[PDB]
Structures are given as structure tokens and as C-alpha cells.
Structure 1
Amino acid sequence: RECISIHVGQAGVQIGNACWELYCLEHGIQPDGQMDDSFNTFFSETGAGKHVPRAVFVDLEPTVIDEVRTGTYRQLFHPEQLITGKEDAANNYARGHYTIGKEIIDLVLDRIRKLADQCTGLQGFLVFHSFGGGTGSGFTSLLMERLSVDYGKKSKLEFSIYPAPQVSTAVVEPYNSILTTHTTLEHSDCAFMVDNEAIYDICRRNLDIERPTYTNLNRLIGQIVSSITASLRFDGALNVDLTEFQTNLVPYPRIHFPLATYAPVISAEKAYHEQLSVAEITNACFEPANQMVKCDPRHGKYMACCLLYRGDVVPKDVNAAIATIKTKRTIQFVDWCPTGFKVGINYQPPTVVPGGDLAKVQRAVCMLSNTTAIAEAWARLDHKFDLMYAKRAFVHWYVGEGMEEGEFSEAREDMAALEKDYEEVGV
């Protein structure tokens, strides 16, 4: 079992330096780069007593790359993998895909192929990016189209950071997301979304951290994406590989946007006072405010969800928990897939970063759940997009790059084509 990761844009490298911070701590790998089969899916054996990561951090702006090259994890990452551009995308899907993308995709694609040649058990890929940025929206759309025509059959996990309803970092981020989703729809097998404001109230309420940064955020997101691949690393009573999440979550080829939520998220002083068990965590993840995406689940119906656990958790009490959750009438499962449960257990417990706000817990759980609760978000993104598209605002840059109103018009009706079938299956 092997899988190659790729991080794009400002959002990717903050996920890169954080998510790889705990992997080397999980396998007992010191930061210098050295200390039997669990680390094979993310670290190769470089001759004798040295490792190297299976990742590519591409970014147009080198302001993040030189920081990592001059950071503390210098001896770990390959200097060739830290790819550098020439100039930033400027929150332009057109500039990050067509002008700046084409003159560097020939180097990035050849770099991906030569690393994939020596692989033998390459299960798939996982992409880290954000449609609200320029490099994460433009350059990621280029490689996904160019590698899908090459490989195609292999799986892909798109970990994209989406915009919030009222919170927003930029103004052109609807234009970045509306264009790239037209290309990401047909080639991305499954994309797990993340919201920026959804993390804000989580740490404020549960972790009671009133001045964190991205380093606290990405440490949690890095732990979330470590649990989904934890079955392949360490042994488990009921293991699941990378192809398991492609079938039991994507019933239709275009409806491939599951929500995500994670629990328990308890502070240090609060962990000793709170009783850790299977019942409260199994109820906490289905709680609507405890999600990584601010979308009302009660406005729709759930299609299917997977209950992947960690640590010494017996398989019986988890079956009783999902059985009790089925009886709760506060939620409502759709009649098209009522038995949409997928239990999973792993023996290796959750790790802990030294000095981090997250506390040690003997058991944890991660959730990916397909539902019709995302259609209200796309409806909101279309309405706010119509305000700017009507006035033709922030359009002279894209056509100044080379685009035109045609693909902008095709991108608008594509969401309308996505609005109808989410409401149809929601019946």
C-alpha cells in the first residue's frame, strides 16, 4: 500500500508542514530524517538509515518554500520536491492554470511520473489545496486534468478548503471556485470539503483557545487526514483501504461531495474531568455544530457515513452506538440507502504533538458522510455569484488573462445542473 500526496498553494503548505509534523512523530522519526512496514506508504527506505517523504509541495509564490527550506524540517524533505514558481497567481484561476501553469506543469508532471514509476502498490492520490486561492484553484485544476487523462483509474482524495457563508478572506474567491468546480466535477473521484469558519467556533467552544493560529488549525486537519489513512499504516480488526471510501460514499458519479466531522476535541485540563467513551463521541460527531462544515444537516437527508475509530475500541459497543443513533428521530436517513453504515477499527491510538493544545485520548473517531446538506451551500454560492456576474465585476482581469464570458456562463449553468439532482435525490 502506497499513496503519493501533493500540496498546492498557501493552503497546502500550511497543511503540509503541519500534517507531516505528526507522521514523523507517529513512526518515531526524528526531524533530522532518521530514527518496518507501517511507514512504507508515506516514507521510503533510502539505502540505509535514512528516509524521504512521498510528497510534492508545488507553489507559484516561493515565499513559503524558502521558509521551509530555512525551517527546522530542512534535513527531512527532498530539496527537489520543494518546487518553486516565478510569480503568484493573484487569485486568478486563469493565470494559475493557463499562463503560469503551462510553463511549469511539464516539470511537475515529469516529476510525478518518475516517482510513481518505482511504486508497486500505488493505491491512489490525495490532493491538498483550496479553491478560494489562486494557486490552489488554477494550478490544481491543471494537473488534475493532465494526470487524470494519463492515469485515470487511480483514486483521488481532494481535501479542499471552501469559503464560509459570511466569513471570507478575499472577494474574488467565488470566481475562483465557480470556474475550478466545472473542471473538478468530472475528474475528481471524491472531494472532502473543509470550511474555514467551522474551525473557529470549534476551538472556541470545546478547546477554549481564544487566540489560536493556522498552526492549531492544520494540526487538527493533519490529524483528520492521518486517521482516514490509518488503516493502511497499522493493523486493524476491520481494515479499509483507499478504494473503500470511493464506493460506499459516491453512489452517483457526480454527487461526490461528502461532509466531514471529527471528535473528541477536548483540552488538557478538560480531558481529565470528562469521561472518554464511545457513546458521547458517537453522538458528538452527528451534532450539527460539531462539524468541519457549517451546513445544517436537518435541511436534507443522509446518504451514507463511515465510522472509523482509533485506539483500543472493542467492536461491540460501537455497534450498539450506531444502533442507538439509528433510533434517534432527531436525524433522518434517506430511504434510498438506509443501511449506510461502515464501521472501522484501528489498534494504534491517536498521537499527541509536544506543546499542542490537543490532549491525549485513548480512543477517537473520524467521519465522512455523504448527504444532501451541501446543496444549500452551492445555492448560496450561486446567489452571491449572481450579484457580481450581473454587474460584470472582477471580469476584466480574467478576460485580460485570456478567458471570456462563455466558460463563465458554462460555469454558472453547471451549478444549476448540480442544483437539480441534489434536490432530486433528496426526495
Structure 2
Amino acid sequence: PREIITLQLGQCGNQIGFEFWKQLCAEHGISPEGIVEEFATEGTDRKDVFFYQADDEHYIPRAVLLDLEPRVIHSILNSPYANLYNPENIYLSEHGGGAGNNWASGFSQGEKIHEDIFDIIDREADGSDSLEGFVLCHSIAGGTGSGLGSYLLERLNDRYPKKLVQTYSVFPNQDEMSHVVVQPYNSLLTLKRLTQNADCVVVLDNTALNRIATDRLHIQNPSFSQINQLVSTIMSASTTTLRYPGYMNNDLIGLIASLIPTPRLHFLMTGYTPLTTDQSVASVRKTTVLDVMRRLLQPKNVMVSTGRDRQTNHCYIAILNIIQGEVDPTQVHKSLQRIRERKLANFIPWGPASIQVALSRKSPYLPSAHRVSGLMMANHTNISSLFERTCRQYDKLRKREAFLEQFRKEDIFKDNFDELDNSREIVQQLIDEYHA
């Protein structure tokens, strides 16, 4: 019916998808090894849209996880949520990889394991006779997720041409350049494949993570154990129309169709306010829907590093405001009434704009059926500031003679560096041209 195959790949893409499947059992009322609660069918009306359909009421995840590093998968099998995963769909015990840290490693390893990489991931494709598409849950940081992920964006474009492609990709961190220095090279090589060899992306910045991780979360030493908490909730938040029973844009080709203006303009800004557990003691007094979307357009919950004074000459075109759970829908048109009076979104002068609001009932659970949740999927034309940030860090590195002799020994014979530079400037010029 609407079966999606997630493509978890890389050192960071496997960990953000590990707790994504772990989030799904707590809201479906199911255990990874059994069914102890009856809340799975009376409370939740649809479960076989991301999981594989049941053979013994065991909803297998439709997931594949490949990585060169064996460290990310050795921290999985000792956890009690790995018995839900199957040891025959992806790998058996003692799976390995390369050495290995290179973008050209996984780019060259795709055609030497070409027979095996297109054998076991295609067995899940013909399980349903109407496949939705493929989401590449991969990474941009490092050479593991960026090297091999650029290969599958090409060969799955023609072997599966009538399928939706759209990824929840995480952006790397640009604070210092000591541990990694190959960061401007492997990022722009995948970013070219994300626009012409891929339809849509969902950007997730790393410098904007610790802006939120010290905002309300109150940590002193930033660890990697907090990167899975902001990411796994908004992943399950994006499929609330798709997993839980909704009516309009209840498919993944429903939501993405109403937000993309044009190809190579698909970078969607994400926002999510409620992350604090001591808000729970004051949501008993009928906290309404009239105050939760006034702060979405206000740049506080954003996960995109952008300029603060560059929003006057930029214009919103498509903005999504997803409320979940208890909505009190007699005032949801009242919340959309107050949008035109502030004009917090700058509107495009050539065409109409749209503020789309939708709702779906959440899990039968006490932290879910009590507190209001707001998921934002914006589309603003100030996203070229990240593309100006990455390009200015790209041409400055090529004048310092950095990784021009250390990178072209394997499988690179011609200069494909300006092939990425002009196509990035094509994106940056067509964005500003789009508001005439």
C-alpha cells in the first residue's frame, strides 16, 4: 500500500534511525519482542506503513543499515531493542567494512559490492505491489555516510524511476576544522547529488543543535548522546498524518507535493517547540492552540543557521504548521485567523502563499494525550546563507593547496571541483530570481 523503505547509512545515520525505530514501539503500544498491550489496534488504527506487515503480530522494521565502521552496530545487539531487528535482512553477526575514512572509499566500494548491495535490499521491494519510495537516512559528516550515499542516489534513480525520493539528512558541524579537514570536499559532492539526483531533502544543522541543546536542556559538556533526542521525535512527528489515521496529505507524496516550489529548491526549515518535561504540570488548565503557532514563525525553534537581518528581502512561499494530539479543533481556524494580521511571513510578490495546518490524534499515552505539540516544515528563501557559508569555505580551501594532491590518487583524474561550484551558484541565483 504505502510502504516506505528507510535507507539508514553511515556513522551518524545509523544512530539517528536506531532510536527512530525505538520511538515507534513506545507509541504503538508494542514491545520489540512481544505484544503485551491491547492498545495497538483499538488506539492506533494503522501500523503497517513503516513496519513490515505482520506474520505473528511481529511488526518487522523495513530497515537496512550499512556502514564501514563496525562500532555503531556493536552498540546495538546488547540493547534489548535489537531482537526486533532481523539478522538476515541486512547482515548476520560479525559484519565489518573498510579501514576507513575517505569520500572516495565508499564511492569506489559501491561497484565492487554491486552484486550484494542490490540483492537483499530489493527483497523488501516486491513485498508490496505499490511501493511508496525510498528515504535515505544518511549523513553528510564524515566520509562514511557521504561516500557511499552518493552512489545510491544515482543507480536508484533509473532502476526505480516512479518512486519518491526525499531524505532526512543531517548537516555537519563547522566550529573548528582540526579533527576533520575534509569537510568542505565530501559535503559539496553529496550536495550536488541532493538537488539533481534527488527530489527533496530535510536539512538538519549541527551548529543549530547545540543552540537548542543549551537553550532549555541545560548541559555543560556536549556529548553525542543528545543528538538522537531532537532528531527521533521530529521524524515520527513528520509521519503523524501517515502513521496515525489522517485524511489530507496522509502520504509522504502528499506533504512534499504541497511545499516544493520547483526542483533544486527543496530545502525545508524545521521547527519544534515542546521539549521540556516541567511544562506538564500547567497543561491541565486547557492550554489552547491559539498560542502555539505564534512562536513557530518567530525564529526561536529553528534548526537552520541563517542571518537575522536577511529576512526582509526574502519571502516565505510555503509554511507547514502541524498540530498533534489534543487540538481543540473549534479554535484551529481561530489560530489561522491571527496569521494575516501580523504578517510574520513575508509573502512572495509574484504569486500566492499558503499556511497549511493539519491535525492527527497521537498515541494513547499520558505524555502524548496531554501536551500540545507543534511541528513546523517551513520553506524560506534565506537558505542560501548556508550555501554562501559552505561555498566561501570551499573556494578558500582550494587556494591554500589543501587536499589537491592527497585526494586525486584514487579514482579521480579530472577536476570536478568547479562542477560543484557552478551548480551550487545555480541554486543560489535561482532562489533570489524566484521572487520577481
1:177-209, Cα deviation, whole Å (9 max, x unpaired): 111122221121110100112121223223334
- Indicate whether 1:51 and 2:88 are aligned: no
Residues 1:141 and 2:141 aligned together: no
| Cross-structure match for 1:254 | 264
Verify the 8 A CA contact 1:155 1:246 in the aligned structure 2. Answer: no
Q: Hey, what's the Cα distance between the residues in 2 that align with 1:209 and 1:317? A: 37
TM-score, normalising length: structure 1 = 0.90
Please state whether the residue corresponding to 1:278 is helix, strand or coil: coil
Higher helix share: 1
Contact kept in structure 2, 1:310 and 1:364, CA below 8 Å: yes
Describe the SS at the equivalent of 1:57.
strand
- Provide the residue aligned with 1:332 in structure 2: 346
Q: Residue deviations 1:391-424, cap 9 Å, x none?
A: 2312323212221452112111211222211121
1:423 to 413, 422, 432: 432
* TM-score w.r.t. length of structure 2: 0.88
Amino acid at match of 2:380: T
Separation in structure 1 between the aligned mates of residue 243 and residue 259 of structure 2, nearest angstrom: 22
After superposition, where does 1:165-204 map in structure 2 within 5 Å? 166=175, 170-204=180-214
Matched, 1:86 2:60: no
Deviations along 1:207-249, one digit per CA (max 9) or x if unpaired, are 3344564333312211101111111222135453111123212
Deviations 1:235-265 (A, max 9, x none): 1354531111232121111211111111222
Match of 1:356 in 2: none
What is the distance in 2 between the residues matched to 1:398 and 1:350? 53
For the 8 Å contact 1:105–1:143, the answer to whether it is kept is no
What corresponds to 1:112 in structure 2? 121
Quote the Cα distance in structure 2 between the aligned partners of 1:352 and 1:382. 47
In 1, Cα distance between the equivalents of 2:307 and 2:418? 29
Q: CA deviation at 1:352?
A: 8.0
Gaps (5+ residues) in structure 2? none
Q: Which moved more, 1:112-121 or 1:79-88?
A: 79-88
Identity rate, percent = 31
CA distance in 2, matches of 1:262, 1:235: 21
The amino acid that maps onto 1:50 is H
The answer to whether structure 1 residue 67 and structure 2 residue 75 are counterparts is yes
**Using the alignment, how far apart are the partners of 1:166 and 1:69 within structure 2?**
33
Kindly indicate whether residue 348 of structure 2 is the aligned counterpart of residue 348 of structure 1: no
Partner-residue secondary structure (3-state), 2:168: strand
1:142 to partner: Cα distance: 0.7
User: Structure 2 vs 1, CA of residues 330 and 211 (structure 1 numbering), >3 Å: closer, same or farther?
Assistant: same
Please give the alpha-carbon distance, in whole angstroms, between the structure 2 residues aligned to 1:397 and 1:378. 25
CA 1:146–1:89: 2 relative to 1, 3 Å: farther
CA contact (8 A) 1:311 1:350 kept: no
Residues 362 and 369, structure 2, Cα contact 8 Å, conserved in 1:
no
Mapping 1:8-407, distance limit 5 Å = 8-35=9-36, 36=41, 38-83=46-91, 84-90=95-101, 92-98=102-108, 100-164=109-173, 166=175, 170-211=180-221, 213-236=223-246, 238-265=248-275, 267-273=276-282, 276-296=287-307, 298=311, 300-349=314-363, 361-407=370-416
Deviates more, 1:272-281 or 1:190-199: 272-281
Is the CA contact 1:33–1:51 (under 8 Å) kept in the aligned structure 2? no
Output the amino acid matched with 2:266. H
User: Residue deviations 1:349-389, cap 9 Å, x none?
Assistant: 59689xxxxx9853212111111111011011111111111
CA distance in 2, matches of 1:67, 1:253: 39
